[PDB]
């Protein structure tokens, strides 16, 4: 326990007992891939092609949800990297 | 493990031994919030008795009716509206008169379901094992009736056929 921290990086326990054991070399590339996929899904559902009732595409929607997620994945990747993991 | 109904789960702490009909069936752990099992057992037994009477009335009204015309409706849910409000208010007042004294009784007593109702003295002379067996019979039959009366209500509301 003791999620409180004062050093350079928080302890790996703040990532939960599922991300605490992911190597940073896995989280990092996974975070970048998720960010790219989410940005592309957002730019394909909107921006590049205007949205319409007949075109919603749960893949692009679910995808776009990987952009907010990506943020968390690379934050966890940095936390793991600084904690020698 | 300790549940007989769900042989894999362990029952909650308050489900043990006494209070016949205890088969360890409380997966959601509702018993963990109630201070005791007295009130919930009283409510379960009241539901069991009301459901037994409801199933019996459902079947009898399906087959037997009073001589008057106002009681000639075969569908119980349709008879709920066809029967004059006088009969229903009389039934409700009788139930409330029975219910107020038991309202004083239930929230404080050790056996709130024990209303002292035994006009035929079916329990006088019975041993403890026989009494517990009778309680188990009552609880079983009541649970089955509850399921059955809810099924009858649902099938009448969904198909209009009050029986079968």
């Amino acid at each position: 326990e003791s999620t409180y921290w004062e050093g350079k990086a928080p302890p790996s326990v703040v990532l939960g007992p599922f991300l605490s054991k992911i190597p940073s070399g896995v989280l990092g590339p996974a975070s970048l891939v998720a960010l790219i996929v989410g940005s592309y899904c957002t730019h394909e559902s909107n921006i590049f092609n205007t949205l319409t009732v007949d075109t919603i595409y749960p893949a692009y929607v679910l995808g776009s949800f990987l952009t907010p997620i990506s943020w968390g994945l690379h934050v966890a990747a940095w936390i793991q990297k600084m904690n020698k993991a | 493990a300790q549940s007989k109904a769900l042989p894999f789960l362990k029952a909650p702490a308050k489900l043990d031994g006494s209070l016949a009909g205890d088969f360890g069936f409380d997966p959601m752990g509702i018993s963990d919030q109630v201070a005791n099992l007295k009130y919930v057992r009283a409510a379960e037994l009241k539901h069991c008795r009301v459901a037994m009477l409801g199933f019996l009335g459902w079947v009898v009204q399906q087959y037997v009716h009073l001589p008057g015309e106002i009681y000639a409706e075969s569908n119980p849910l349709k008879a709920l509206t066809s029967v004059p409000l006088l009969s229903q208010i009389q039934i409700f007042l009788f139930i409330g008169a029975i219910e107020l004294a038991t309202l004083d009784q239930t929230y404080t007593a050790d056996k709130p379901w024990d209303l002292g109702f035994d006009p035929l003295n079916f329990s006088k002379g019975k041993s403890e094992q026989q009494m517990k067996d009778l309680e188990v019979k009552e609880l079983k039959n009541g649970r089955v009736a509850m399921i059955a009366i809810m099924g009858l209500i649902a099938q009448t509301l969904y198909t209009g056929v009050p029986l079968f």
Binding site: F18 | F8, K10, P27
Partner: protein
């Protein structure tokens, strides 16, 4: 060090389990999740796939106690969700799975429930530990084979239209 993959080292979380531990985890999923949860998921997939493979094969051969059951287990899904059978099976499956959450949560927390154990042996096909371990290994091998077989069955029966050969 691994028994299944001689090149890669033995997985850290796989030492011995009567479920058929041959040390096959190249991606190290056992490090991610508790081994017990993965075992429960694998056994659930095994049983579902075995039932589904048997049902697909049988329902294409002899399944017509009525009119709406005159389908070829490929158009059966839509026809029988329209009929209402799949709704009932889903209701009971949902009840069983909702109970299974507590079973999975009672393990991973304490208790003694082995993964995939529901104490369902009404006919007592398994008697002692040796029979239990042997038949657990047999069940998991059959379930993996059934997973792959059902995958093949659906992929082939969607890549073409045919009977049992697919």
């Amino acid at each position: 060090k691994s028994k299944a993959v001689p090149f890669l080292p033995r997985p850290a979380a796989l030492d011995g389990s009567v479920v058929g531990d041959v040390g096959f985890d190249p991606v190290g999923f056992t490090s991610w999740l508790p081994l017990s949860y993965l075992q429960e998921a694998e056994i659930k997939h095994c049983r579902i796939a075995m039932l589904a493979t048997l049902g697909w094969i049988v329902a294409d051969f002899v399944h017509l106690p009525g009119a709406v059951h005159e389908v070829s287990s490929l158009a059966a899904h839509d026809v029988a969700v329209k009929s209402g059978a799949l709704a009932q099976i889903l209701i009971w499956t949902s009840i069983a799975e909702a109970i299974s959450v507590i079973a999975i949560s009672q393990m991973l927390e304490g208790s003694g429930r082995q993964p995939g154990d529901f104490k369902f042996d009404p006919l007592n096909f398994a008697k002692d530990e040796k029979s239990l371990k042997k038949m657990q290994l047999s069940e998991l091998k059959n379930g993996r084979l059934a997973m792959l077989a059902f995958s093949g069955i659906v992929t082939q029966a969607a890549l073409t239209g045919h009977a049992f050969p697919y």
